[PDB]
Design a protein around this nucleic acid. Structure first.
Lengths: 114, 49, 48, 53, 48
RNA sequence: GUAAAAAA
RNA sequence: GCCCUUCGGGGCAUUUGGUCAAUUUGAAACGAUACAGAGAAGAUUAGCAUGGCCCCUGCACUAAGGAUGACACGCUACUCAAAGAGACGCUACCAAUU
């Protein structure tokens, strides 16, 4: 049954029809462009080597700021110290490029499937 | 117009003219085809043949 | 530029297997059962 | 969902046409889009997808 | 086939009429070469 | 039968 | 018509427009009637799309619907062989029971 089919030849864009103006399509809106003002930059080139210099200046400043550069009730029981080495999780957050094994997804499934 | 660079299509058209003895139509097609596709040696071989 | 010189081994290396779906059969074909189970790796799957 | 499928199929096809060496016969490429559909169904059913050859 | 038989019988027995099945929204491919693209002229004459 | 000249 | 005049003259105002008002032959369309008759590889069917010499309703020419609106389902040689193995191929047709 080939009624329900894929697309091998997707529709090609066309020049607009040309004719007299009667149908109203697109109501005017935001009819003024904003331009970059004094202090908003954009129209401010320094130079290639200048821009390079501020790039390593800013990046070295960030790196330097990161580095810091200016009989007992609990002895009756049978299992002991079973939660040592558990609260020490939380050194570095690892992004994992596999969604079904991410901590986000594990959290999601724990919260919602019970 | 739909398949400008199709060797099989160019050969079909050229052969239809040659089979029906339209030699001048066919040679015009052969010049057009080896202009269109100058690195397709099939069209060059057909033309020399 | 001049065409790439290919071998029959290049042609064989780019031939594509005919897809047998485990779910879809739009034409209602009767597929032999070995062909139906070829692409399953659960025959491959090893448990220790 | 219908639009996502259209975009996905166009992307996979463009990649395959650009991956194919010049001179390979290239009629059956819609075949690869059928393999793509089957692999997606295999992912949804958690069935390993492995086409021999 | 039945309409062809009836039309042949009418044409044999005299009256000739144009049974025209031409619908609303259909071209007349008999009437004219559709979307005609003539072969490009080349260096060879093709008038004969 | 509601939406195209001895195999409802 | 008016005005001016030096009584000879001069001035003011200046080119509309829609094929007739005429219904057979320069183009309206339903309904009734007749007929048939609703997608997805058993049965029943929620749909969402795709392409445009198919459109309809809608303000939507950046909704939504129209059976998922319909159409789709025919057809099917043509860039085209090579190896090695045969050929009473390519000619004639033929004299004893007792």
């Amino acid at each position: 049954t080939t009624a329900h089919r894929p697309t091998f030849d997707p529709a090609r864009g066309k020049e607009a029809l040309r004719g007299p103006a009667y149908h109203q399509r697109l109501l005017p809106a935001y009819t003024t462009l904003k331009f970059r003002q004094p202090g908003q930059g954009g129209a401010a080139d320094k130079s290639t080597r200048d821009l390079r210099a501020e790039l390593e200046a800013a990046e070295a400043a960030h790196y330097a700021k990161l580095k810091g550069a200016p009989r007992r009730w609990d002895e009756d029981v049978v299992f002991k110290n079973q939660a040592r080495g558990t609260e020490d999780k939380g050194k570095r957050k690892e992004f994992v490029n596999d969604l079904l094994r991410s901590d986000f997804h594990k959290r999601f499934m724990s919260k919602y499937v019970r | 117009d739909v398949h400008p660079n199709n060797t099989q299509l160019w050969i079909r058209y050229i052969e239809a003219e040659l089979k029906n003895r339209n030699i001048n139509h066919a040679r015009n097609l052969l010049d057009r085809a080896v202009t269109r596709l100058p690195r397709v040696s099939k069209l060059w071989y057909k033309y020399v043949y | 530029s001049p065409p790439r010189k290919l071998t029959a081994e290049d042609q064989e290396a780019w031939r594509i297997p005919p897809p047998v779906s485990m779910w879809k059969n739009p034409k209602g074909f009767t597929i032999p059962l070995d062909k139906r189970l070829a692409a399953d790796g659960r025959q491959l799957q090893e448990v220790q | 969902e219908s639009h996502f499928d259209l975009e996905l199929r166009a992307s996979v096809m463009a990649d395959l046409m650009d991956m194919m060496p010049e001179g390979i016969k290239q009629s059956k490429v819609n075949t690869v889009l059928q393999h793509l559909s089957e692999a997606w169904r295999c992912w949804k059913s958690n069935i390993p997808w492995k086409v021999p050859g | 086939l039945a309409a062809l038989q009836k039309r042949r019988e009418l044409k044999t027995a005299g009256i000739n009429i144009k049974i025209t099945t031409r619908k609303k929204g259909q071209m007349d491919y008999n009437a004219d070469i559709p979307f005609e693209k003539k072969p490009a002229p080349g260096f060879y004459d093709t008038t004969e």
